[PDB]
Design a binder for these strands. Structure first.
Lengths: 185, 48, 43, 37
RNA sequence: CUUUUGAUGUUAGGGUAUUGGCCUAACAUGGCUAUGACGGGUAACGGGGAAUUAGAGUUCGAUUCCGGAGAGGGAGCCUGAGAAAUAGCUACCACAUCUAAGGAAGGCAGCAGGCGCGUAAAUUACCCAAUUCUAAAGAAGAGAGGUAGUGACAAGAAAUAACAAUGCAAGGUUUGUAUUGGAAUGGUGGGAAUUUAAAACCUUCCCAGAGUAACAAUUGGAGGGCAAGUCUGGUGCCAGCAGCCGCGGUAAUUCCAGCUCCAAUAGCGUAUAUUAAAAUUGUUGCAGUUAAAACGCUCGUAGUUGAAU
RNA sequence: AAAAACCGUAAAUCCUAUCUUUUAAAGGAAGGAGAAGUCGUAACAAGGUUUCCGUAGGUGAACCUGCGGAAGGAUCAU
């Protein structure tokens, strides 16, 4: 009868809907990462709360306990692959301390803006939606794509992009100008 | 859902002074008489 | 017994149109301008 | 209502007389019930 | 409370597939109960689970799976390894179909669909291709099941632009900002590859195909709680708004409108119910002189708690 | 094979009784809300008789009075 595949929410409403400083901080983050909605930042901090809860539960467990010495490096290696923690990091206190902008730095639009390609973060957003960039052998049109610690070396333009060597420019303009040229000649 | 019986103006409380336009409704589910307020400026005219 | 004046102010309020204005810009662009309008000009 | 009857802080009818009037009404009601049944 | 009408037990038997007061005969007077029997209510099928959770908790669970029960309500029965079977039979009750009036025939709480009831819920579609079942077992069937249709129940991703030059503002020739003006790309239409039982969808490719990108985002607010107006007209304790406090009697920051602003955003209000908030049900963790609340007082059984070694 | 009888299973109908739920009703008697209504002045000051409790009787109403209490009293006091 009912389908057997699950589904879950990815965002949580903030409650206390009209905190002035919370609204200001949200607007700052929205503007300086160029993302369309505060639902997106709600998703990011929902994920952040998930990781943080796992980390603090692990910290409650005593050292060299089996659950900790399995899940702790599981989570730590996941964070390292995501690029959320550096090499100088080795413990769980740092994954407790990682923050919202540090999470937001890994979005596709922020990474492509940082690498160049697009001159504004909103330009990067629209370009990703315009499907002109490639994470390597695979094109992505999802701005919320989280780049891992190896793919940033090979984010670049998609091979089908006009900026990637495809169809040069406006075919309408080119055809019109060539018709004018052939008529004049 | 119910059937409109008639329309009535009800006094507001003492500190205020207004004639709230309500309607008397005969509920089709049971047959009970209830009083329902009609929101809006001229919405009483919108109901027969 | 004084239901005859229901909606008098609504009925007798003078009617004015919505004029023409400009299409309001929405989406990520809408957040763009209300983000960038609070630091540059002010000081 | 309970042990905090009287307590005239609000200028109400004296609780003793309210109780007496209620008892008179109850006597009348009991007499009517006995007459009916 | 149960106990003539089996209630509790013994003995013997009957019956059952088997044990058994399951039933029968005799006998005995037992069995349960304030640790709540026996009753009543449940808008009660139970569980796996769900919502909300700091931790405790509170509420929900008709509904994917498991178990139970039922096929309008009862009862009875045949076949069969297996049924007290219901798209099997028999009868009664209530409905209800055909009839030439003599008689026949029925059970959608299966899939669609209709009426009714309602605040409240989809197509009288396609197919056995997948899953699996039945058979005389490849080859046939299967409203099981799958596929599509309706579908803002929920859930996820995600458009409504981005960019270059002057004019203007701010700053020592840096940011924002009306003009131009070229790129980019979906939405859309058509063909195709593909997908598919067939078809559709997705994906991919090829043609056209955005300047007011008219390919035009809404919902609800702007006194406080609570983000955003002592802006402009109308009304004038009327109309109305307002969850609460309150606003409205000529200057209405609250009504009716326009402009602007705020909030969330393809979503946003409303109603009811529920959780947190609620340490306002308190085991964690409440309060009892005066806010509600120490029995008038003592004895006392059950209960709860009990010196050291 | 029809058919009949007897234990049993036992639908269904009717009578009676009880219980549950809903509901009509002359009359009676409350509560709440409303309006500038009528009569008085009960309480808050020693509220003009200190207030209040239990009980009993009486009165148009608030209320009054007797008995025994309390201070939440108007006295922490020769």
């Amino acid at each position: 009868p009912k389908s057997y595949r699950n589904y879950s929410k990815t965002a949580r409403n903030p409650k206390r809907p009209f905190e002035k400083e919370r609204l200001d901080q949200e607007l700052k983050l929205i503007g300086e990462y160029g993302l369309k909605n505060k639902r997106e930042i709600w998703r990011v901090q929902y994920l952040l709360a998930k990781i943080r809860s796992a980390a603090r539960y692990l910290l409650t467990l005593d050292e060299k306990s089996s659950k900790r010495i399995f899940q702790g490096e599981a989570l730590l290696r996941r964070m390292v692959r995501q690029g959320l923690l550096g090499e100088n990091e080795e413990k769980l206190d740092y994954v407790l301390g990682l923050t919202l902008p540090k999470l937001l730095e890994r979005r596709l639009q922020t990474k492509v803006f940082k690498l160049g390609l697009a001159k504004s973060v909103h330009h990067a957003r629209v370009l990703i939606r315009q499907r002109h960039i490639r994470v390597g052998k695979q094109m992505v049109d999802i701005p919320s794509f989280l780049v891992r610690v190896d793919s940033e070396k090979h984010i670049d333009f998609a091979t089908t992009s006009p900026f990637g060597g495809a169809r040069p420019g406006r075919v309408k303009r080119k055809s019109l100008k060539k018709q004018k040229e052939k008529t004049e000649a | 859902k119910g059937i409109v019986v008639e329309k009535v103006a009800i006094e507001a409380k003492q500190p205020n002074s207004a004639y709230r336009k309500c309607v008397r409704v005969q509920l089709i589910k049971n047959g009970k008489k209830i009083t329902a307020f009609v929101p809006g400026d001229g919405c009483l005219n919108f109901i027969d | 017994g004084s239901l005859a004046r229901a909606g008098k102010v609504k009925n007798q309020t003078p009617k004015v149109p919505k004029l023409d204005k400009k299409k309001r810009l929405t989406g990520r662009a809408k957040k763009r301008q209300l983000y960038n309008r609070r630091f540059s000009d002010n000081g | 209502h309970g042990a905090s009857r009287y307590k005239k802080s609000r200028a109400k009818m004296r609780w003793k007389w309210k109780k007496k009037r209620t008892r008179r009404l109850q006597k009348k009601r009991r007499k009517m019930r006995q007459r009916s049944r």
